[PDB]
Amino acid sequence: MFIGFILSNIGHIRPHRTILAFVSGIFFILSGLSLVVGLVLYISSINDE
Amino acid sequence: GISIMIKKPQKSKPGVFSFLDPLAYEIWMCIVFAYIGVSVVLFLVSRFS
Amino acid sequence: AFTFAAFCYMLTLVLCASLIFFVIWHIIAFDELRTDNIERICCLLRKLVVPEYSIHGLFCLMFLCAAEWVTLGLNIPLLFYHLWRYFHRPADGSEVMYDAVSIMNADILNYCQKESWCKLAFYLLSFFYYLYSMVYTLVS
């Protein structure tokens, strides 16, 4: 989320290269997929014990 | 005489691939290779004739 | 009894029946070539051959996962023959390759016809090898 945020602000101040916005979208999506694996691991660790 | 004392067995927490367990692993291997089997035979039947 | 290895032999009778039909069509194509024709038997052959590899390439990964090491080993001489005709000698081509732009000049025409009867002789012996070890693994 912090990588995708600082690469979104570069995409707001230098829009001459547009690929800053799409790649920062990828870090915003790889972050949320790492929550889900984390929250499945977190909840399943409780239920096992 | 001499006997064995073990801890009384329990619910036995699941693994990662515990969802596969209603069918034996010999079934799942036959399912995967029948999947490529019917897909090749679909391809043979539809391309030629 | 029925098992996963017995199913790996059932599933390769069905696909070796396709492999012999690739080769009956492959001996007719070069016999009709000599009678007449280049550009069509370029295109008609070129579409056929890549199914013939990967079906046999399926058999390699199927008997590897079935733990059939004699059967995987008997598919090895046809396999490493197949890697040579696609990685080092599919001469230049670049449409698919191999039974492509390179026809007459007639020296590959003799090499293909020796191959075309060598494919059928292996596949007809593979069909009865697969039919035997099917009946073997079922009864035993």
Ligand SMILES: N#Cc1ccccc1-c1cc(-c2ccccn2)cn(-c2ccccc2)c1=O
């Ligand atoms: N419970 C559960 C469950 C939920 C969804 C998919 C599979 C399972 C499951 C099924 C089986 C099983 C086994 C034999 C016959 C039928 N089902 C076993 N397990 C399981 C539970 C605890 C530890 C290991 C496996 C399981 O977790």
